Amino acid sequence: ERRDLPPNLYIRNNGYYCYRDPRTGKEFGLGRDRRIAITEAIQANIELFSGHKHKPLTARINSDNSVTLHSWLDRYEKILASRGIKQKTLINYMSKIKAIRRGLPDAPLEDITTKEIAAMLNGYIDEGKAASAKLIRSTLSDAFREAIAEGHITTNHVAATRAAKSEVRRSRLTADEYLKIYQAAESSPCWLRLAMELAVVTGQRVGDLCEMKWSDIVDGYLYVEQSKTGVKIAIPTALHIDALGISMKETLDKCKEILGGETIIASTRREPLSSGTVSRYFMRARKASGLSFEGDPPTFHELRSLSARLYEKQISDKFAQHLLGHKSDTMASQFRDDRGREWDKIEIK
Amino acid sequence: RDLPPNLYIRNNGYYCYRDPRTGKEFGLGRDRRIAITEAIQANIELFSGHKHKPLTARINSDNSVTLHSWLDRYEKILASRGIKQKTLINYMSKIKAIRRGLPDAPLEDITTKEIAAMLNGYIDEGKAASAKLIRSTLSDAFREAIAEGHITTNHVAATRAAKSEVRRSRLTADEYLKIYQAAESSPCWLRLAMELAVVTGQRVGDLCEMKWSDIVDGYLYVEQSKTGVKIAIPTALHIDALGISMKETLDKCKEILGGETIIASTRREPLSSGTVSRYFMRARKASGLSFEGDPPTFHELRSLSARLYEKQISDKFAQHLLGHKSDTEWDKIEIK
Amino acid sequence: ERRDLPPNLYIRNNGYYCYRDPRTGKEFGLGRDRRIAITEAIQANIELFSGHKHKPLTARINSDNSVTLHSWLDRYEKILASRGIKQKTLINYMSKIKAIRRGLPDAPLEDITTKEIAAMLNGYIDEGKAASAKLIRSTLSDAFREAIAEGHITTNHVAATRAAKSEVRRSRLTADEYLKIYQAAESSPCWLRLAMELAVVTGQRVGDLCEMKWSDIVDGYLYVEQSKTGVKIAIPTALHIDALGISMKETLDKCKEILGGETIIASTRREPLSSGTVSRYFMRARKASGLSFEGDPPTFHELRSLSARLYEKQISDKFAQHLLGHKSDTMASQFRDDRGREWDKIEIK
Amino acid sequence: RDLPPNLYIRNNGYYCYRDPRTGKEFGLGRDRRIAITEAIQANIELFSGHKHKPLTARINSDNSVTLHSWLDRYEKILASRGIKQKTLINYMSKIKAIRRGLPDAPLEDITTKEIAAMLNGYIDEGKAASAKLIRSTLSDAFREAIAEGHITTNHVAATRAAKSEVRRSRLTADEYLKIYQAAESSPCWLRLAMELAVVTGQRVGDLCEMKWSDIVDGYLYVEQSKTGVKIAIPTALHIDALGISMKETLDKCKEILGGETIIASTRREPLSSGTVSRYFMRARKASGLSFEGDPPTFHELRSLSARLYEKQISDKFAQHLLGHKSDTEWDKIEIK
DNA sequence: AACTCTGCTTTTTACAACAAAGTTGGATC
DNA sequence: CGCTCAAGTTTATATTAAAAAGCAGAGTT
DNA sequence: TTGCCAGCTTTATTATATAAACTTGAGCG
DNA sequence: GATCCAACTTTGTTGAATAAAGCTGGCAA
DNA sequence: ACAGGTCACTATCAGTCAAAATAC
DNA sequence: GGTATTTTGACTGATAGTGACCTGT
DNA sequence: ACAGGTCACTATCAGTCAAAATAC
DNA sequence: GGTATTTTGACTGATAGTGACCTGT
């Protein structure tokens, strides 16, 4: 007869015991009492046998009596409904939540770790969904605060994490290209044209463009109530874009004769259209024009950016700023940037 | 029988640890050896260590004051802050509010959660604003509570103040006229007050405070109850869009009202701030107009007052009359 | 004969032991062991007799290395000298320290309590030296920060407390009063007058005033380098204050003839003066004029405030701002404010 | 025996508790019973427990990390961030600095204190700025350390950044002239580079990268290496205060220098950024002028360039030229 | 009056991270 | 017909903090 | 011929604490 | 006679967060 | 028969307050 | 003469340690 | 004559490592 | 024929409990 040497467990020359995780190779100190070594030994022998632990009481206490991710998000949700926000803001957020449900365990909050979070966050970076991550993060983040504001938690695990910063990919649109798409838009219904023209001439948001009524015009002035920021403007029917040969007045009355409807921009059956279709068809003429660009191809909104860019040089910087329904002075210097396209010709000026 | 504290055994020989905090017990397993183990682990968590030095008489008694009892001294702390008789009461109301929202346990013991709990209570009934001030004050009391070191941490600070869109709607020129009209069944000063109010754009609270002694060589001296700003309004003002002249307003007051105050009762005596708005109110409802949100109120007259003075003379004037010193729609895109 | 019941200590009906602080009246729980009760009991009987406590090994660790106020303040000091600051900023701070030294215990950091801080802080309010309190506080605070920055501590006890808020007492000066003082200034040496006039016409800081050289003037413009903010200006020798009948040029040549020295403002023995004396004598003239004010009587700098207030109404608000060496938007408004004194008469304009 | 751990007795029958942390021993008294008491007290403080479950092997390990070992992987994640090769080495230099300032112990065990300690070391020597960047970086490393959860807490964050006053003095028009003159003993390109630099107000780093192929129909195309901004400088510019014409400067470069690069070596090849500034330096010293603080340097020329363009034509022009995008002594108060 | 010490009250006014460069002291081919 | 309460909303203004002063009552030559 | 649901990218503005009020239902002398 | 690093200092560029969009893919009629 | 847990209830527990028990 | 404070124990609210009684596999 | 508190000094203590010793 | 893992008994750095020495009253 020899020894009852629990596997993985070894003894030292004086009679001191260690357990060796064969995972890392690192030994561990137990004590002097064979009896007790033994015991702890076996416990660990079954752990390797299955990510299953005798988890400390500390743990098991704190547990059952404090949250559950999905369960709180569910409440998160409702709190948002309360904030008093615009219907779409909401759903943007909603989407992200959803995102989280699907990225994370429905476990207890404090038991969510930084790493787990980053882990899924990074999942979204690696696929090239940089921007996403930001918002996902951002929101998740919030959810927490508030969760903490309702004291289920003590600390935001997210805020320890780093926001992916995103270099914008959408290329800009040059005067040349517009004309080349204006041309391709031939096979497209007649309103796309006018919308285009209008778009550049008023430099207004597509969303708002689809909302203008013929009753919005009084004594040579087009009144617009911006949907996004609520700022109010009256655009004079006198404007003209010299670089592309478009007159606002001339654009507007083509819309009265050929489109005819309550909306300045209207469908072929005389009804107002959806923001999304207008960019949607502009998209088609983009592909149909066949031009090549670096990164993502420009889109409709781009029209508003070209609009400001040609307004800047035609009359003034202060003018481009005012038409855009645009107040701040951090962006007339970021709605001016070319993003690598064509060379800011410094003049003798 | 070495049965560690808070851990108990069952019929079969099943072991359980009981959190005394909740009362719920917990499953362990079958080996006393390992039960024990986790047992003490547990009794370290809730209880890390044990004794105390009876030199923690001399420490742990005055450590616990309790909400209500501190609020009680909070109060008196405020009394010394040196502020306006009403301000105090505002606050006071808050407190009370709190009294009725929270247990009377010790400070240390109150939870973030519990707090918002009630806070939210106030949102959900639609009394946002209140929330704010409740919060905000609760907060304070805590601050100074830690000021005197009964605690460590402002639990409040972690919570969020609701943000409140104001509902009181504004009053337009049309409507005022419509009310001035309904004001017929009302005692005569209402009208005068109204006019006065629009014309002087002054706070009802001060309006009720104006003496005929306040007028010297064509100038009305006002000492603003609220901010202490001093102004002299010239007897020459007139609001064109509604056809009221200050001077013609003022002399109607001396003839039909006759009293120490410019605005007075039918019994020749000074009126109370609240009555003024109060009767205005009745005229509101008797006019029968509808609006969006809550109906405008007397103060509103000061707002209309400025809105019509901005257009008639200048924005600089509106600010001057109101009692304002500093600064804090349909834009015109010019041809330049 | 019966028993050895240590005073303050009593027994219960079943044999449970408690000590009664007679200080409070409140009892406390010991246990079952007569022997051990006894023990803790005597410990307590000592305590009553000496502030002295058998304090913890706990305590007794953290203290032979976790510093001492005065000791750290001494090091605070030094950090300050390194911050790269103006020679007097320094002393201001310095004075406050000192303040602290004399307000508080030379104990260990974490042992300082908020209340102790308050207590002294209040000492300073109660005496009416409101503002002081502020800066004391402020700095103490800082000292702590940094102390925390070097980890002797973990928590700013300071920040818990609140800063006295100070209503400014210095009354302002009206045009009439200036005349009144200009008059009593007769008994005073000649430069006083000139300085006064100069001060109001230049609206410049006395400190800068005393540092102007005749070499600072070229081609009808006076160059000034403000010592306080470093702002650089050129005042034209053409200025005139009509409400008081003072011409910059006429004022300046008075200085050349009767004062004669390197400095535009100079002593009777042709040397540069000390900022303080200037104010100092102005004071004398103040007292000797005999006028009554509410709160504290205005003083020389006040000349700068008068200067702006009469510049405001004479030419423009934009001009008053340019002359001062003052830039932003919280001040050419917290300088046109009145403070009890004058009633803002509104007009028909 | 009864003798509790870390408590030792002396030859007399004197009791002491030895703090294992420092090594320092502590006095208690003569009574064993009391000794013991406070003893274990002590022994809860440092260690309450002593035990773990060996089932806390599966947590102790991969938790256990050490500075240098992490910095080691810190490094690697930097390489992935996608940045310009120099940025990286800046960073890496910092790293190194850290290695040399701090123990290679485990993260959790690094104290605020020690950090400051070393940071201040860099202050005291007058290397203000460095401290900042060291800090800055160290901080980051920690952040992402926690991002992978070996730690809880950024001890850095509690520390403060030295704030530093810029020492490099400015260059005035007179001085440049005096340097241009001393530059006579220097190879010919120096002069040209200098002129070019002022006239183009371009980064030395970019100056040395300009090709004769960069010029089309009177315009010099420059792609700024530092921020990627693209500009076309017209060959018609001239600086009046110093008598230098861009076109005249450019063609002295084609005849005297002759090479693919507009600025070139004596052997017709492209020069190293560093050399250019380097020789400029020589001419500085050789000019013999005195300055307050650190002496101006080549880049200085770009600053001069802007200062003289501001006054000659416009503030909007100087902005356009330097690849400056947005806005970020004496101002004549005329009587307006 | 002239000159420094001192305990006080006012005026003024505002950076932090990331990036990605630029300046110069010695160690190498 | 007016009051003072109370539970609620609304409007005005001062908001931190680390730097540079300024100003008058002594003590001392 | 449109129509909205569902998963991504982009475009914009930017605030919180103190004081000190005013509103207005209720019940009170 | 120039190179390359390594250690240091600059200078330009973006900084969070919430809020409100926009734009192509399909499966639904 | 048994893992995971709950109840309901008396036999210490941790303590108060006013009447008996000397002390200023 | 007579009120600050010590003690002493019947009067008292509460939790701990048992075991009876769920429950859901 | 001793409270307070420090040194040195080897016998555990808590391991790592590359040979020796079977598994796959 | 020849790589994964377990043991295991000399090789190694650091503390823990002892006393042998300090020293300021």
Coordinates of all heavy atoms in Angstrom, one line a residue, chain B residues 2 94 103 176 183 193 316 327 332:
Chain B
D2 N -21.2 23.3 17.5 CA -20.5 24.5 17.0 C -21.2 25.4 16.0 O -20.6 26.0 15.2 CB -19.2 24.1 16.4 CG -19.4 22.9 15.3 OD1 -19.4 21.7 15.8 OD2 -19.4 23.1 14.1
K94 N -41.7 72.2 1.5 CA -41.0 71.1 0.9 C -40.7 70.1 1.9 O -41.1 68.9 1.9 CB -39.8 71.7 0.4 CG -40.2 73.1 -0.2 CD -40.9 73.0 -1.5 CE -40.6 74.1 -2.4 NZ -41.4 75.3 -2.0
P103 N -39.6 57.6 5.5 CA -39.4 57.1 6.9 C -38.6 58.0 7.8 O -37.9 58.8 7.4 CB -38.7 55.7 6.7 CG -39.2 55.2 5.3 CD -39.3 56.6 4.5
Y176 N -57.0 89.9 -24.0 CA -57.0 90.9 -22.9 C -58.3 91.7 -23.0 O -59.0 91.8 -22.1 CB -55.8 91.8 -23.0 CG -56.0 93.1 -22.2 CD1 -55.5 93.2 -20.9 CD2 -56.7 94.1 -22.7 CE1 -55.6 94.3 -20.1 CE2 -56.9 95.3 -21.9 CZ -56.4 95.4 -20.7 OH -56.5 96.6 -20.0
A183 N -64.8 91.6 -17.4 CA -64.5 92.3 -16.1 C -65.5 93.3 -15.6 O -65.4 93.9 -14.6 CB -63.2 93.0 -16.3
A193 N -56.6 97.9 -12.3 CA -55.5 97.1 -12.0 C -54.9 96.6 -13.3 O -53.7 96.8 -13.6 CB -55.8 96.0 -11.1
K316 N -34.9 97.6 -25.6 CA -34.2 98.2 -24.5 C -35.1 98.8 -23.5 O -34.8 98.8 -22.3 CB -33.2 99.3 -25.1 CG -32.1 98.8 -26.0 CD -31.9 99.7 -27.2 CE -30.4 99.9 -27.6 NZ -30.2 101.0 -28.6
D327 N -29.7 90.8 -19.8 CA -30.2 90.3 -21.1 C -31.0 88.8 -21.0 O -32.2 88.8 -21.3 CB -29.0 90.2 -22.1 CG -29.3 91.1 -23.4 OD1 -30.4 91.8 -23.6 OD2 -28.5 91.0 -24.4
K332 N -35.5 87.0 -40.2 CA -35.4 87.6 -41.5 C -34.0 87.3 -42.1 O -32.9 87.7 -41.6 CB -35.6 89.1 -41.6 CG -36.2 89.6 -42.9 CD -36.4 91.1 -42.8 CE -35.7 91.8 -44.0 NZ -36.2 91.4 -45.3

